[PDB]
Design a protein around this ligand. Sequence first.
Ligand code: HEM
Length: 399
Amino acid sequence: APSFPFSRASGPEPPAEFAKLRATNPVSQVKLFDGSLAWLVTKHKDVCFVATSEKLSKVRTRQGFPELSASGKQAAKAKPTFVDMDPPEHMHQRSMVEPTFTPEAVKNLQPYIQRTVDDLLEQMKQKGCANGPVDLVKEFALPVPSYIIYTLLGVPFNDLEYLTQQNAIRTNGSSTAREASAANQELLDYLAILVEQRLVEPKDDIISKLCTEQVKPGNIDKSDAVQIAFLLLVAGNATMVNMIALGVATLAQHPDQLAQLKANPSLAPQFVEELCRYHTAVALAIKRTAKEDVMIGDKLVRANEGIIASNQSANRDEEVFENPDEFNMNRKWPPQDPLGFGFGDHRCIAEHLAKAELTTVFSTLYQKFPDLKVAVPLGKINYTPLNRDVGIVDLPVIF
Ligand code: HEM
């Protein structure tokens, strides 16, 4: 059994192991860091089964749960938030914060998302690049999702820049363990203050709704409110930043597709759809433990055995997506859902918001900067370390 997780084949590529497994061993066992074994599911149909089976659990206190790192094992000791819950607890807590993320709410949020993107791009234009390239990540990819989530949560305008930087330090590969920890705890302390504040004087934000509708009535306590707001912040921010950066790099890699997008920004939604399939930046989130024996393919997963369902491999499943390793914004989509945002009950709560942020970015970026170009050879792009989910650390650009 090979050690899992695998390392990407290269900066912008998924691990090479998946294609071979899909072809000759779709459901197999892998060895985790602690020496325990777990079942790796690689086919789309099977990943969907794992994501919806009621015989499988997300509860991390169940022996056999596939923790992939020492830190993951430690984090499993804390009181869980809906991300690690099974029904009925899952939706009982998730429904507390779903309103802001519904397709309807996101549609009504479009003007705000557009304004945020516009202002950040305008800031870039004003600053210019007369003295050399600027980092697209620091100046745009990072602040866009950060400002939006922080604002929706309840953070005041004047605190956005500092908090965006601290949250970045949390996941920056350059941060030492102490630095990452300090930034993490610091964000929690800040959220605790916002909760105390909103409890006394609620405003029009997520934290206020949690305080008024859940804390005051006694449905949850203050610390719970903090953890839920914290989950909403850290769950998808780093991913968003990486998706925006990967999107820009991808368009640079395929000139004609960038030409097409520039000539028709209405293709942004299709482009984002392909981007979320092709670059599955969150590939290790669909994990379960079997509550009882369950058959998957030609394998029997016994009770208490862990399962890791690769949505990344599923999105490259040739049986569902023809020419899966080809990035094509004009792709003819099958009836089967690409799994960039997961599947089933736990499917990304912010899928619609995430898609809206990305479509707003890619329907605007090249209208504002039609001559935007990565200021370094594409093969020299600084990607996240290969043993991590795909992403880009910094991306110098000129325009
Ligand atoms: C393009 C960026 C994003 C991608 C690709 C992404 C992807 C995912 C994936 C694969 C999962 C696992 C779903 C499953 O268990 O089947 C997930 C869960 C989740 N995501 Fe996102 N996400 C993104 C952005 C966001 C944002 C912006 C937020 C916060 C506003 C967020 C909050 C969450 C939460 C809280 C969960 C747990 C949901 C649950 O277990 O019920 N995500 N996301």
